Design a protein around this motif. Structure first.
Motif, PDB file in Angstrom:
ATOM      1  N   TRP A  47       0.788  -1.233   0.000  1.00  0.00           N
ATOM      2  CA  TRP A  47       0.000   0.000   0.000  1.00  0.00           C
ATOM      3  C   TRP A  47       0.827   1.293   0.000  1.00  0.00           C
ATOM      4  N   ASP A  48       1.717   1.394  -0.987  1.00  0.00           N
ATOM      5  CA  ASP A  48       2.544   2.564  -1.195  1.00  0.00           C
ATOM      6  C   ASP A  48       2.055   3.217  -2.479  1.00  0.00           C
ATOM      7  N   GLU A  49       1.128   4.198  -2.341  1.00  0.00           N
ATOM      8  CA  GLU A  49       0.531   4.965  -3.436  1.00  0.00           C
ATOM      9  C   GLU A  49       1.617   5.512  -4.364  1.00  0.00           C
ATOM     10  N   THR A  50       1.475   5.258  -5.680  1.00  0.00           N
ATOM     11  CA  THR A  50       2.430   5.658  -6.708  1.00  0.00           C
ATOM     12  C   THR A  50       1.734   6.423  -7.825  1.00  0.00           C
ATOM     13  N   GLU A  51       2.354   7.524  -8.278  1.00  0.00           N
ATOM     14  CA  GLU A  51       1.855   8.338  -9.385  1.00  0.00           C
ATOM     15  C   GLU A  51       2.568   7.904 -10.666  1.00  0.00           C
ATOM     16  N   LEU A  52       3.482   6.927 -10.535  1.00  0.00           N
ATOM     17  CA  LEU A  52       4.195   6.329 -11.659  1.00  0.00           C
ATOM     18  C   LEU A  52       3.297   5.175 -12.170  1.00  0.00           C
ATOM     19  N   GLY A  53       3.737   4.470 -13.191  1.00  0.00           N
ATOM     20  CA  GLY A  53       2.919   3.393 -13.726  1.00  0.00           C
ATOM     21  C   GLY A  53       2.103   3.864 -14.898  1.00  0.00           C
ATOM     22  N   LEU A  54       2.054   3.032 -15.935  1.00  0.00           N
ATOM     23  CA  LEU A  54       1.377   3.253 -17.215  1.00  0.00           C
ATOM     24  C   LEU A  54      -0.030   3.814 -17.086  1.00  0.00           C
ATOM     25  N   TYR A  55      -0.801   3.272 -16.132  1.00  0.00           N
ATOM     26  CA  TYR A  55      -2.174   3.707 -15.920  1.00  0.00           C
ATOM     27  C   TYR A  55      -2.309   4.546 -14.671  1.00  0.00           C
ATOM     28  N   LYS A  56      -3.243   5.486 -14.713  1.00  0.00           N
ATOM     29  CA  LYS A  56      -3.461   6.448 -13.647  1.00  0.00           C
ATOM     30  C   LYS A  56      -4.776   6.222 -12.915  1.00  0.00           C
ATOM     31  N   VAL A  57      -4.897   6.812 -11.701  1.00  0.00           N
ATOM     32  CA  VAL A  57      -6.116   6.768 -10.899  1.00  0.00           C
ATOM     33  C   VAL A  57      -7.233   7.419 -11.741  1.00  0.00           C
ATOM     34  N   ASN A  58      -8.403   6.768 -11.794  1.00  0.00           N
ATOM     35  CA  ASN A  58      -9.594   7.173 -12.567  1.00  0.00           C
ATOM     36  C   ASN A  58      -9.612   6.794 -14.055  1.00  0.00           C
ATOM     37  N   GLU A  59      -8.499   6.274 -14.560  1.00  0.00           N
ATOM     38  CA  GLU A  59      -8.379   5.816 -15.940  1.00  0.00           C
ATOM     39  C   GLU A  59      -9.259   4.586 -16.185  1.00  0.00           C
ATOM     40  N   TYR A  60     -10.020   4.620 -17.266  1.00  0.00           N
ATOM     41  CA  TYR A  60     -10.864   3.516 -17.707  1.00  0.00           C
ATOM     42  C   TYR A  60     -10.004   2.529 -18.437  1.00  0.00           C
ATOM     43  N   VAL A  61      -9.911   1.293 -17.899  1.00  0.00           N
ATOM     44  CA  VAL A  61      -9.043   0.238 -18.448  1.00  0.00           C
ATOM     45  C   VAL A  61      -9.774  -1.076 -18.735  1.00  0.00           C
ATOM     46  N   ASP A  62      -9.003  -2.075 -19.186  1.00  0.00           N
ATOM     47  CA  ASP A  62      -9.468  -3.443 -19.314  1.00  0.00           C
ATOM     48  C   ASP A  62      -8.718  -4.212 -18.212  1.00  0.00           C
ATOM     49  N   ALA A  63      -9.409  -5.025 -17.432  1.00  0.00           N
ATOM     50  CA  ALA A  63      -8.732  -5.764 -16.363  1.00  0.00           C
ATOM     51  C   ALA A  63      -9.025  -7.237 -16.520  1.00  0.00           C
TER      52      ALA A  63
END
Ligand SMILES: CCN(CC)CCCNC(=O)Cn1nc(C)n2c(cc3sccc32)c1=O
Length: 140
Positions: free
Chosen positions: A1-17
């Protein structure tokens, strides 16, 4: 649980999971991104709120499928996302990744076969009904 602003996808981004158990892809939305690339995505499914918030390995999350590969452009060896029903193969099912294995065409009939990737293993030479609904996989 270490919140990251890095990573291909962002918070609120609509994705396929990808559901780990079934191996099928569902429209979801990034609700939180943590660490320990190898970031962890916390997603909620658009049509399944009852499934809560699920932690996803970064390989089980990608940009939403948007491009249909037309029948004429389908080739043996392409890895695509298509609709298949493993229990009832003639019916509508879920969206799975699959390797196109055979492509047949006569004047009035078309046949598509694929090696379908499920929960853990591959299901070889599945007959694909939804030949006009084959998706290109979004890759970074
Ligand atoms: C063993 C019983 N056989 C025959 C009846 C069915 C196979 C097992 N059960 C299923 O496929 C049912 N199922 N259905 C949906 C829509 N989702 C599931 C996980 C997730 S994550 C998002 C949607 C979704 C899920 O598990």
């Amino acid at each position: 649980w270490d919140e990251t602003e890095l990573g291909l996808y962002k918070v609120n981004e609509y994705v396929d999971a990808r559901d780990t158990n079934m191996g099928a892809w569902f429209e979801a939305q990034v609700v939180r991104v943590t660490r320990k690339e190898d970031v962890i995505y916390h997603v909620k499914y658009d049509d399944y709120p009852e499934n809560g918030v699920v932690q996803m390995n970064s390989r089980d999350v990608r940009a939403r499928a948007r491009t249909i590969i037309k029948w004429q452009d389908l080739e043996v060896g392409q890895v695509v996302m298509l609709n298949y029903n493993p229990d009832n193969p003639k019916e509508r099912g879920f969206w799975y990744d699959a390797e196109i294995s055979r492509k047949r065409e006569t004047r009035t009939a078309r046949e598509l076969y694929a090696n379908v990737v499920l929960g853990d293993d591959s299901l070889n030479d599945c007959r694909i009904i939804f030949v006009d609904e084959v998706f290109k996989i979004e890759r970074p």
